[PDB]
């Protein structure tokens, strides 16, 4: 635990650690929701586990996947208030980039911008980090399918395929085993439906459970647009496999 | 929703319009020695014969930011402009370096000018009175 | 105590402890004496023992000439005194420019007290740990003026006042030797009284006493060796008394 | 901060008291060519007989200007610095559209008081681009553009011999001929010809004194 | 206008028909008497099915169009596809709040599911008028009577195309600031269609 | 009132030491080792590219960044602080020197600017000191090659060879036993690879090593041809294949 | 673990477990407020408030617990009265701004998002405290009927049935029973009767009480928020009494 | 933060221009602070050339009663001697301005100082009333009578801060103090402060000055000085005698 | 006491400022610098803190700095704060030269820097500058001048002084071996002997010293500064036998 003035602000501990950032990382995994992101030949798929423990809650109003712009989609792990705050900030940043530089914002630049904001939060004493982990997925015109992730510490990096949540280790190990088996670093399917089916099967195998149409939230990013699949589409994908 | 700065003129003038350089003997008159402006610059001369572009340049970025805040308020709500202004005020208030005038890195990051250069940055900008640390401390803390 | 960690906190008994701590810091520095004569003012100061490898050519004078008719001495912190002296000189020149009339002693003392008060109105500043003695003559008559200003911003008018370390002994000597009914008519008597008062606490009066004399018409003469002559004469008279 | 307005009233007081080029751009099937003359005149007098009027914003984005020479040079240098910083920040090849946006916004900020009329050519991963920029902040897109005092003769030559599908050699020859016509028929144009050719996927080729 | 500033001496015509809207213009940019550009794209896209044409100062109109496009991107990030009325309102607010320093006039043609295609005109000064059709520019003055005599409501696509072609051909013929090709954008429910007509086509009408 | 000021976050201990700066140094010493060794015709900068769960692309995140075409830098400590400092250093290099004298700044002046920024960070009541240490290698016409180390306090020192991070003492001893006045660029690269081989706990291949050189001019990286006076970049980044080929060989 | 010492004296501090204790204390303050419920029928939303009978000196005319934001928006809250009143005022300002801009009534999801952003913005700095109110609001727009509940943390969700206050838990159970009794749908009058029944079941604390029921339906109030009239209110009270 | 939120929430008030604090204060919307500013605030047009606008809209004679009043300034002469200061003005005017008392052409700044009126009458009246208030405040603060030089310098600085704005006033501050003696200063709207012994301002200033210089002596009598002043006035009649105790009116 | 040391704007019950005292005590962890004023020149000699041979001793800019052509400074303490203050002093000297067309006197610059340092000790948001300066200069008013300034903001004038880790022993050595009629060579020898006797490492090698001398004469009567290169330091050590 912390000891001294390094309990409310972000300053160095005697061991050279920032405790508030670590506690924000702890806060990120308090939603008990796992997400997966995999890039195909010409598409990107994000699948988030959906839990509705209360039947008095409208399922259609529960969503952690946001449409930042035409081509960029975002998935947030953590509490929904900071998720929505980050979504609004990302929308504003993408629109301002498009206005100022004359072309659409790529995923990596947006991830770097959010990481710089996170660094501001981690260095300023009177500002606190957002306890959320952000994953931007798109199909950049210069780099193809792209998945990038940023954390409360201000660190961002791109992934061939990524998993997040309390049970992210098993999914990551299964993904590494699949990549070693295939050694192409991506998914060979040429249709986004097949990539969604593969992601569903991988999630089912990793978590050891079977989902319904209301237990998943799927977003697909193509070259032209990013769209979130509805309940009927997920049900069709489940019936197919 | 302005593009060119507007209402840049002053509606009224006074001898004590600048409270920071008020004379201690007569608080209703400016102190010419501490102004260090040459001693022959009445305020009236600042109302006539000005370049028609100085006001536009000195209020350009502020006008653009105000238009952006207005658009956010119209589209997103009050929370977004409130948060932007709160962050900017917090960054500005906690920085006090009397020996430099360069802006902080965090301010440039918030203003989305990390990799942008204008003539203000290239050209940021002796006296016997009022150029020490104590004057800046008094100005900062309202003493 | 719990009521001494800020300048904006009142104690239950009705005291501000930070002001008292600033006064204690003032009472740590060298002594400073101001004596008012019939038509002259004398400022005496104590200099710590000069080290062998210290340059005595440009050693600072404890008495600073704010204006051609107003002088200032201090006790406490030297750098804060420099800041206050700079501000006082700037204000004197500004007032002369604005009103064509040189500052009066009371006006300058009030300005110094106001600056010291303003530096107590915020929690982000440290008040000056300096107590000042301002001496002079108003530039329209021959009335001596001596004022004492404290870190809290309080200024008072005195006839003979001592501030600094071991000021109680000098104050008692002045009380037992100075009478307001018959102030020293001549400059020599006032200088001798100041030197004798300073000798009560100074180990060596040959090299630790500084005397400055202010007279009407804005003259201000600082005594050089002459202080040694006064010390020797006082010692001779004391031994004659013995 | 920024450009100063000091001594403006003094300059007006002194003034009241009596105290005082051919550029072409041709877009061909796989790139863009920009050519210019090489004579600098201080009025009637020829100050320099070989001057480089082709300035570089980015390794593959070049421009040539007219109007106020100091303003043109300063604006080009500032936009080049901004483009380099943007490319370093994004780790991507700069785009001509970004330079166009920066130039347009900077010129519109000063409301036409910065006199610089530019032809900007470039090649980026999205393709080849050629733009004309006015001093007030208005930009136009074209396949062949001309600028300067000899722009009418150059435009006549370009209109005479322009086609949709042009090779690199044909485009270079057309630009050289336009600059030559401007040199011969206009008093303000003379000397040699400077050319810069930019293809897709290849380094920019800068030829000074292409035709002497 | 300011000294030495480019002026948009164009010919603009927006017509509403049974299935949507069509916005057409010429392609000439002049410098008094010298044609600076024979081919220009005067049809500015503000949103996927919201287009406009500009008149007055070129720089001011371009800045206003960029700001409006940015505003509509921000709006779309929140509430989806906007309406022609919203874009017209943003244009009108920008033009009216800045009429003391900027000279700008806009013609906005849009389509949406609710309103099924609309035309708005914002002349110099900053007032917005909703009309079944609108004409603007230097040449528009020569086809007022012709357009008045030959306009019908709920025309077919080809009838509207022919009407715009004939009217713009006459405007080009009688005006020295109107150019060669005619560019038209058709906004309907199916999508966005682009048409171009050459002088050898419409000069023989 | 109590809102127009903030108390200083960095204060002196009774022993005469600044606690925040010492804690920043401690945080730096816990980071991945980064080293730099200067030769007679070049400077070599090397670092280990530690990775998260093996699904990330190591090429996307680069720990060695070009500051100017002749000056590069590497860090040990916190990534976002290094990224922010790199952006600010590039902007300062362009504003202060390129837009004034028409030339890129020399290595010492850019290092001094970075040190000034870090010192201003340590003197503020609103921000904590930076938690990185920077090794900056550059070349200039009037001073040849140079290598500098910048600490979180804003103190910069010249170095013939140095290393920071976890394995710094052992690396310093090895470089002291290896460095000589007649060393060349290839020998420096070999020594840097040998020093890194003793500090990497995992796979010592080209995918986990980032290496850059301040050598000679590179006309092929300039981007255009035609100006003999203009020269190519003097800062180059070694690819994975080149690093692997050097690893297989001596 | 309900009392985190050392990490609960400031608004924007993360605990070692990664929790904000000021927000949870605000939730605890909400749990001590009056019970308020909201139900969503086929084409409308019904709000019910159980109020305590205060002194007879109060005017029974101008004192209304249920707050009105806009003609199609109804809102109730449980917690601290000043915070809820301020939140209602902010919602009214937001709805007025949206209608003034886009010439249409503000859609319910947009209103909920704006309120959630405003509430969440108060958990970012140590100079402000989170609102101590949970707000159940709803209305009717072009897409139909919407009902939302917003927590002190700034999190909001859409609910088939929402309950807050002291007697929330049992009320929630009753609400669940409602979903287990009318899965296909529910009418507005049945919604009013069931709201009265649930309020009567969940008010067993004792001190006499009163019931306030309001509704907003397309087929009953032309898509407007109106209080239940005396006849239907008395019918609902009689039905609730008979059910017990 | 709450004030920030309020500042970003919303037309009718904006058009009324009541969103500005200065407009609210000038119309007494929220209080009487407009009458609480020791240094008065003067309104100027919000245009690029306020000075030429004011000059064009002032040099337009259309209504005789809508014009700015100008002080008489026929002939005013002031001199000093061992007995104090003698000031002499003309009681010359009718013009539809019938009044109970004669027009006062000398401003009574305080019981010890006198201010001659010339040029614009309103400027002289307003600014000398302001000067009297400043002198009274200074006397209260310093517990001493303010010197004439200090007041003249205050007025000179005040009129210099608005140089070229449109003020047209020229005054002669006359006083007697124990510190200095008898003092006369002249301050005009240009910014000139001039200490003098004999002053003559007006249309017939030349003849009066010649008469004064013909028979001027430092050592004279009060009757002789008054007769000399009256004769100099009549060469081209209110009289004031200023001594250490104050000013006494000797009009005839 | 920890009750009154957290802030820089709190007086202790005894009337002491703990932060200033801690900043003054921080000087003892830095190298030794010595300034000796001779009858015809000024000698500045500082001892480095080099712990490894890999440090570049050729770039001998660690303790001795130039403010203008006539004033030089010896630094003891944090290098970054010293660099900030040195840049400020250089800018101030250039401003004075531009304003008056005369070189700034040493005392004015020393007083300006001392005022800045004192101001940094009076604001709660600014910590004191943990540096000490030895100023050596020449001007037409007082000839040769040597000054010392500490973090508290106090400056004093001396004939021969030292600041650093061994102030007491070096001061005693200077007191025992100082004459008012010494020349520049005698001052150089005295500084070298004082550094040699008061050292932590016996081997007083060339690569651990920084030397500077300000001398009159030059062309015909000018005053010039000479910052000794390592070769010159080695030669002087060989001449004195210290090596």
Swiss-Prot record, chain A:
There is a cross-link at residue 225 (Glycyl lysine isopeptide (Lys-Gly) (interchain with G-Cter in ubiquitin)). One of its GO terms (biological process) is proteasomal ubiquitin-independent protein catabolic process. The keyword Ubl conjugation applies. It is found in: Cytoplasm; Nucleus. The keyword Phosphoprotein applies. InterPro entries: Ntn_hydrolases_N, Proteasome_alpha, Proteasome_alpha-type, Proteasome_asu_N, Proteasome_sua/b, Proteasome_subunit_alpha6. Its main location: cytoplasm. Pfam families: Proteasome (PF00227), Proteasome_A_N (PF10584). It comes from the Eukaryota. Keywords: Acetylation, Cytoplasm, Isopeptide bond, Nucleus, Phosphoprotein, Proteasome, Ubl conjugation. Belongs to the peptidase T1A family. This is Proteasome subunit alpha type-1. The gene is SCL1.
UniProtKB/Swiss-Prot annotation, chain E:
It is found in: Cytoplasm; Nucleus. SUPFAM superfamilies: N-terminal nucleophile aminohydrolases (Ntn hydrolases) (SSF56235). This is Proteasome subunit beta type-1. One of its GO terms (cellular component) is proteasome core complex, beta-subunit complex. Its main location: cytoplasm. Keywords: Acetylation, Cytoplasm, Hydrolase, Nucleus, Protease, Proteasome, Threonine protease, Zymogen. It holds the Pfam family Proteasome. The active site is at 10 (nucleophile). GO terms for molecular function: endopeptidase activity; threonine-type endopeptidase activity. It is an enzyme of class 3 (hydrolase). It comes from Saccharomyces cerevisiae (strain ATCC 204508 / S288c). Coiled coil: none annotated. The proteasome degrades poly-ubiquitinated proteins in the cytoplasm and in the nucleus. It is essential for the regulated turnover of proteins and for the removal of misfolded proteins. The proteasome is a multicatalytic proteinase complex that is characterized by its ability to cleave peptides with Arg, Phe, Tyr, Leu, and Glu adjacent to the leaving group at neutral or slightly basic pH. It has an ATP-dependent proteolytic activity. PRE3 and PRE4 are necessary for the peptidyl-glutamyl-peptide-hydrolyzing activity. One of its GO terms (biological process) is proteasomal ubiquitin-independent protein catabolic process. The side chain of Thr-10 acts as a nucleophile, and the N-terminal amino group acts as a proton acceptor. Present with 7250 molecules/cell in log phase SD medium. Its EC number is 3.4.25.1. It catalyses: Cleavage of peptide bonds with very broad specificity.
Curated annotation (Swiss-Prot), chain F:
The keyword Cytoplasm applies. There is a cross-link at residue 108 (Glycyl lysine isopeptide (Lys-Gly) (interchain with G-Cter in ubiquitin)). Gene3D superfamilies: Glutamine Phosphoribosylpyrophosphate, subunit 1, domain 1. The keyword Transcription regulation does not apply. GO terms for cellular component: nucleus; proteasome complex; proteasome core complex, alpha-subunit complex; proteasome storage granule. It holds the Pfam family Proteasome_A_N. Keywords: Cytoplasm, Isopeptide bond, Nucleus, Proteasome, Ubl conjugation. GO terms for biological process: proteasomal ubiquitin-independent protein catabolic process; proteasome-mediated ubiquitin-dependent protein catabolic process. The proteasome degrades poly-ubiquitinated proteins in the cytoplasm and in the nucleus. It is essential for the regulated turnover of proteins and for the removal of misfolded proteins. The proteasome is a multicatalytic proteinase complex that is characterized by its ability to cleave peptides with Arg, Phe, Tyr, Leu, and Glu adjacent to the leaving group at neutral or slightly basic pH. It has an ATP-dependent proteolytic activity. Belongs to the peptidase T1A family. This is Proteasome subunit alpha type-2. It comes from Saccharomyces cerevisiae (strain ATCC 204508 / S288c). The lineage of its organism: Eukaryota, Fungi, Dikarya, Ascomycota, Saccharomycotina.
Swiss-Prot record, chain I:
There is a cross-link at residues 98, 197, 229 (Glycyl lysine isopeptide (Lys-Gly) (interchain with G-Cter in ubiquitin)). Keywords: Cytoplasm, Isopeptide bond, Nucleus, Proteasome, Ubl conjugation. Its main location: cytoplasm. InterPro entries: Ntn_hydrolases_N, Proteasome_alpha, Proteasome_alpha-type, Proteasome_asu_N, Proteasome_bsu_CS, Proteasome_sua/b. The keyword Nucleus applies. CDD domains: proteasome_alpha_type_4 (cd03752). It is found in: Cytoplasm; Nucleus. Pfam families: Proteasome, Proteasome_A_N. PROSITE patterns: PROTEASOME_ALPHA_1, PROTEASOME_ALPHA_2. GO terms for biological process: proteasomal ubiquitin-independent protein catabolic process; proteasome core complex assembly; proteasome-mediated ubiquitin-dependent protein catabolic process. The proteasome degrades poly-ubiquitinated proteins in the cytoplasm and in the nucleus. It is essential for the regulated turnover of proteins and for the removal of misfolded proteins. The proteasome is a multicatalytic proteinase complex that is characterized by its ability to cleave peptides with Arg, Phe, Tyr, Leu, and Glu adjacent to the leaving group at neutral or slightly basic pH. It has an ATP-dependent proteolytic activity. Belongs to the peptidase T1A family. Present with 17100 molecules/cell in log phase SD medium. This is Proteasome subunit alpha type-3. It comes from Saccharomyces cerevisiae (strain ATCC 204508 / S288c) (Baker's yeast).
């Amino acid at each position: 635990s912390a000891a001294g003035y390094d309990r409310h602000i972000t300053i160095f501990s005697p061991e050279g650690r920032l405790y508030q950032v670590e506690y924000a990382f702890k806060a990120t995994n308090q939603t008990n929701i796992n997400s997966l992101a995999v890039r195909g030949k010409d598409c990107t798929v994000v699948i988030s586990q959906k839990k509705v423990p209360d039947k008095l809650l409208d399922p259609t109003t529960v969503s952690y996947i946001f449409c930042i712009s035409r081509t960029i989609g975002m998935v947030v792990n953590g509490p929904i208030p900071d998720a929505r705050n980050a979504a609004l900030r990302a929308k504003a940043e993408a629109a301002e980039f498009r206005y100022k530089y004359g072309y659409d914002m790529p995923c990596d630049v947006l991830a770097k911008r959010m990481a710089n904001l996170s660094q501001i939060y981690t260095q300023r004493a009177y500002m606190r980090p957002l306890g959320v982990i952000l994953t931007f997925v798109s199909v950049d015109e210069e780099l193809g399918p792209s998945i990038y992730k940023t954390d409360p510490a201000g660190y961002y990096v791109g992934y061939k395929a990524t998993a997040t949540g309390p049970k992210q280790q098993e999914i990551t190990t299964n993904l590494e085993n699949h990549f070693k088996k295939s050694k192409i670093d991506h998914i060979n399917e040429e249709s986004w439906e097949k990539v969604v089916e593969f992601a569903i099967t991988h999630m089912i195998d990793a978590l050891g459970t079977e989902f319904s149409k209301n237990d998943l939230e799927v977003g697909v990013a193509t070259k032209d647009k990013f769209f979130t699949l509805s309940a009927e589409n997920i049900e069709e994908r489940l019936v197919a496999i | 929703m302005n593009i060119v700065p507007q209402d840049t003129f002053k509606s009224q003038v006074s001898t004590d319009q600048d409270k920071s350089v008020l004379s201690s003997a007569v608080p209703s008159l400016p102190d010419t020695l501490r102004q260090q402006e040459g001693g022959a610059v009445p305020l009236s001369t600042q109302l006539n014969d000005r370049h028609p572009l100085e006001s536009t340049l000195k209020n350009w970025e502020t006008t653009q930011r105000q238009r952006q805040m207005e658009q956010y308020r119209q589209i997103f709500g009050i929370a977004e402009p409130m948060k932007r202004t709160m962050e900017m005020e917090i960054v500005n208030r906690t920085d006090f370096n009397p020996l430099s005038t360069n802006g902080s890195i965090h301010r440039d990051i918030l203003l989305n000018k990390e990799c942008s250069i204008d003539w203000e940055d290239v050209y940021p900008g002796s006296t016997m009175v009022g150029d020490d640390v104590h004057s800046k401390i008094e100005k900062q803390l309202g003493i | 105590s719990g009521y001494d960690r800020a300048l904006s906190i009142f104690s239950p008994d009705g005291h501000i402890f930070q002001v008292e701590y600033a006064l204690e810091a003032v009472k740590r520095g060298t002594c400073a004496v101001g004596v008012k004569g019939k038509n002259c003012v004398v400022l005496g100061c104590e200099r710590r023992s000069t080290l062998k490898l210290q340059d005595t050519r440009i050693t600072p004078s404890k008495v600073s000439k704010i204006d051609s008719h107003v002088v200032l001495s201090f006790s406490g912190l030297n750098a804060d005194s420099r800041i206050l002296i700079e501000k006082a000189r700037v204000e004197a020149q500004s007032h002369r420019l604005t009103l064509e009339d040189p500052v009066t002693v009371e006006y300058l003392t009030r300005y110094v007290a106001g600056v010291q008060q303003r530096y107590t109105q915020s929690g982000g500043v440290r008040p000056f740990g300096v107590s000042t003695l301002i001496a002079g003559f108003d530039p329209r008559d021959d009335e001596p003026k001596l004022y004492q200003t404290e870190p809290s911003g309080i200024y008072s008018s005195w006839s003979a006042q001592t501030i600094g370390r071991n000021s109680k002994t000098v104050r008692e000597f002045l009380e037992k030797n100075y009478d307001r009914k018959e102030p020293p008519a001549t400059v020599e008597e006032c200088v001798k009284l100041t030197v004798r008062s300073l000798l009560e606490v100074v180990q060596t009066g040959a090299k630790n006493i500084e005397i400055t004399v202010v007279k009407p018409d804005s003259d201000i003469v600082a005594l050089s060796e002459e202080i040694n002559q006064y010390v020797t004469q006082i010692e001779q008279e004391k031994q004659e008394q013995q | 901060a920024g450009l100063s307005f000091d001594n403006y009233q003094r300059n007006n007081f002194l003034a009241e008291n009596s105290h005082t080029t051919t550029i072409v751009g041709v877009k061909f099937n796989n790139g863009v060519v920009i050519a210019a003359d090489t004579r600098s005149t201080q009025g009637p007098i020829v100050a320099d007989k070989n001057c480089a009027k082709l300035h570089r914003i980015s390794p593959k984005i070049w421009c040539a200007g007219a109007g106020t020479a100091a303003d043109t040079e300063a604006v080009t240098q500032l936009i080049g610095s901004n483009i380099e910083l943007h490319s370093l920040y994004t780790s991507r090849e700069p785009r001509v559209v970004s330079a166009l946006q920066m130039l347009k916004q900077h010129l519109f900020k000063y409301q036409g008081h910065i006199g610089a009329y530019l032809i900007v050519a470039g090649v980026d991963p999205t393709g080849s681009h050629l733009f004309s920029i006015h001093a007030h902040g208005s930009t136009d897109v074209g396949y062949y553009l001309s600028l300067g005092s000899g722009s009418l003769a150059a435009m006549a030559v370009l209109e005479s011999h322009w086609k949709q599908d042009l090779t690199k050699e044909e485009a270079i020859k057309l630009a050289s001929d336009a600059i030559q016509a401007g040199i011969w028929n206009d008093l303000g144009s003379g000397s040699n010809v400077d050319v810069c050719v930019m293809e897709i996927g290849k380094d920019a080729e800068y030829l000074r004194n292409y035709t002497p | 206008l300011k000294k030495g500033e480019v002026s948009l001496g164009t010919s603009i015509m927006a017509v509403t028909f049974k299935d949507g809207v069509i916005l057409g213009a010429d392609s000439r940019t002049t410098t008094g008497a010298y044609i600076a550009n024979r081919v220009t794209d005067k049809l500015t896209r503000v949103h996927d099915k919201i287009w406009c044409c500009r008149s007055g100062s070129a720089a001011d109109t371009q800045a206003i169009a960029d700001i409006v496009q940015y505003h509509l991107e921000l709006y779309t990030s929140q509430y989806g596809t906007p309406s022609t009325e919203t874009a017209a309102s943003v244009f009108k607010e920008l033009c009216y709040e800045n009429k003391d320093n900027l000279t700008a006039g806009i013609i906005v043609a849009g389509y949406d599911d609710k309103n099924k295609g609309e035309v708005y005109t914002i002349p110099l000064g900053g007032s917005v008028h909703k009309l079944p059709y609108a004409i603007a520019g230097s040449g528009s003055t020569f086809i007022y009577g012709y357009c008045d005599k030959n306009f019908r409501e709920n025309m077919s696509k080809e009838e509207t195309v022919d009407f715009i072609k004939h009217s713009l051909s006459q405007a080009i013929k009688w005006d020295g600031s109107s150019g060669g090709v005619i560019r038209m954008v058709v906004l309907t429910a199916a999508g966005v269609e682009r048409l171009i007509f050459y002088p050898d086509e419409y000069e023989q009408l | 009132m109590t809102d127009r000021y903030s108390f200083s976050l960095t204060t002196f201990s009774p022993s005469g030491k600044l606690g925040q700066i010492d804690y920043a140094l401690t945080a730096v010493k816990q980071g991945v080792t980064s080293l730099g060794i200067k030769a007679t015709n070049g400077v070599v900068i090397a670092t280990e590219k530690k990775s998260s769960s093996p699904l990330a692309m190591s090429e996307t995140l680069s720990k060695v960044s070009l500051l100017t075409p002749d000056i590069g830098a590497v860090y040990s400590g916190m990534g976002p602080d290094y990224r922010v400092l790199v952006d600010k250093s590039r902007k300062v290099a362009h504003t202060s020197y390129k837009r004034i004298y028409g030339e890129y700044p020399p290595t010492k002046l850019l290092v001094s600017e970075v040190a000034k920024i870090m010192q201003e960070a340590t003197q503020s009541g609103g921000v904590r000191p930076f938690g990185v240490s920077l090794l900056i290698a550059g070349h200039d016409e009037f001073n040849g090659f140079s290598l500098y180390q910048v600490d979180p306090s804003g103190s910069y020192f010249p170095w013939k060879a140095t290393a920071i991070g976890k394995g710094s003492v052992a690396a310093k001893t090895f470089l002291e036993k290896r460095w000589n006045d007649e060393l060349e660029l290839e020998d420096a690269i070999h020594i840097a690879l040998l020093t890194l081989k003793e500090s990497v706990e995992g796979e010592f291949n080209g995918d986990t090593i980032e290496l850059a050189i301040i050598g000679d001019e590179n006309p092929d990286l300039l981007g255009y041809t035609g100006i003999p006076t203009d020269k190519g970049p003097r800062f180059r980044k070694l690819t994975s294949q080149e690093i692997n080929d050097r690893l297989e060989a001596l | 673990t309900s009392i985190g010492t050392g990490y609960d004296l400031s608004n924007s501090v993360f605990s070692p477990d990664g929790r904000n204790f000021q927000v949870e204390y605000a939730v605890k303050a909400v749990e001590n407020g009056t019970t308020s419920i909201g139900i969503k029928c086929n084409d409308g939303v019904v709000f019910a408030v159980e109020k305590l009978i205060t002194s007879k000196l109060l005017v029974p005319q101008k004192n209304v617990k249920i707050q009105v934001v806009d003609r199609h928006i109804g809102c109730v809250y449980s917690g601290l009265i000043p915070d809820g009143r301020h939140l209602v005022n902010r919602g009214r300002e937001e709805a007025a701004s949206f209608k003034k801009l886009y010439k249409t009534p503000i859609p319910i999801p947009a209103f909920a998002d704006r309120l959630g952003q405003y509430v969440q913005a108060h958990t970012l700095y140590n100079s402000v405290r989170p609102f101590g109110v949970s707000t159940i609001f709803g209305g009717v727009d072009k897409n139909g009927a919407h009902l939302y509940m917003l927590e002190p943390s700034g999190s909001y969700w859409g609910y088939k049935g929402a309950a807050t206050g002291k007697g929330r838990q049992s009320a929630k159970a009753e609400l669940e029973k409602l979903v287990d009794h009318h899965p296909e749908g529910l009418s507005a009058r049945e919604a009013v009767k069931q709201a009265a029944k649930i309020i009567y079941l969940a008010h067993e604390d004792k001190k006499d009480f009163e019931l306030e029921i309001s509704w907003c339906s397309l087929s009953e109030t032309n898509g407007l928020h109106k209080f239940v009239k005396g006849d239907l209110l008395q019918e609902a009270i009689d039905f609730a009494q008979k059910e017990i | 933060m709450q004030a920030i939120a309020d500042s970003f929430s919303v037309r009718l008030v904006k058009e009324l221009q009541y969103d500005n604090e200065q407009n609210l204060e000038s119309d007494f919307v929220t209080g009487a602070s407009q009458f609480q500013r020791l240094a008065p605030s003067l309104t100027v047009p919000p245009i690029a050339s306020p000075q030429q606008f004011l000059r064009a809209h002032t040099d337009d004679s259309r209504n005789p009663d809508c014009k700015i009043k100008i002080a008489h300034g026929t002939t005013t002469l002031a001199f000093r001697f061992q007995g104090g200061i003698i000031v002499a003005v003309d009681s010359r005017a009718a013009g539809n301005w019938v009044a109970s008392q004669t027009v006062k052409k000398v401003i009574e700044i305080n019981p010890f100082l006198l201010g001659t009126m010339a040029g614009g009458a309103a400027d002289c009246q307003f600014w000398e009333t302001w000067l009297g208030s400043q002198c009274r405040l200074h006397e209260l603060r310093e517990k001493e009578r303010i010197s004439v030089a200090a007041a003249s310098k205050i007025l000179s600085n005040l009129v210099y801060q608005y140089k070229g704005a449109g003020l047209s006033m020229g005054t002669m501050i006359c006083g007697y103090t124990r510190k200095e003696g008898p003092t006369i200063y002249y301050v005009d709207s240009d910014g000139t402060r001039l200490k003098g012994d004999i002053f003559c301002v007006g249309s017939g200033q030349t003849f009066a000055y010649g008469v004064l210089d013909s028979n001027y002596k430092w050592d004279l009598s009060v009757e002789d000085a008054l007769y000399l002043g009256k004769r100099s006035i009549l060469a081209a009649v209110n009289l004031y005698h200023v001594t250490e105790d104050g000013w006494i009116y000797h009009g005839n | 006491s920890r009750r009154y040391d957290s802030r820089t704007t709190i007086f202790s019950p005894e009337g002491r400022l703990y932060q200033v005292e801690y900043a003054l005590e921080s000087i003892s962890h830095a190298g030794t610098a010595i300034g000796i004023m001779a009858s015809d020149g000024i000698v500045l000699a500082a001892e480095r803190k080099v712990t490894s041979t890999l440090l570049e001793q050729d770039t001998s800019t660690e303790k001795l700095y130039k403010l203008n052509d006539k004033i030089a400074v010896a630094v003891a303490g944090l290098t970054a704060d010293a660099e900030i203050l040195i840049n400020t002093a250089r800018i101030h000297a250039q401003n004075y030269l531009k304003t008056y067309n005369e070189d700034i006197p040493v005392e004015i610059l020393v007083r300006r820097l001392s005022d800045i340092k004192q101001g940094y000790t009076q604001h709660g948001g600014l910590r004191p500058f943990g540096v000490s300066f030895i100023y050596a200069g020449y001007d037409d008013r007082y000839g040769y001048q040597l000054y010392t300034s500490n973090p508290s903001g106090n400056y004093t004038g001396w004939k021969a002084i030292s600041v650093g880790a061994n102030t007491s022993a070096a001061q005693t050595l200077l007191q025992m071996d100082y004459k008012d009629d010494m020349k520049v060579d005698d001052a150089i020898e005295l500084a070298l002997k004082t550094l040699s006797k008061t050292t932590d490492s016996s081997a007083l090698t060339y690569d651990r010293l920084e030397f500077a001398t300000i001398r009159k004469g030059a062309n015909d009567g000018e005053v010039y500064q000479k910052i000794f290169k390592p070769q010159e330091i080695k030669d002087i050590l060989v001449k004195t036998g210290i090596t």
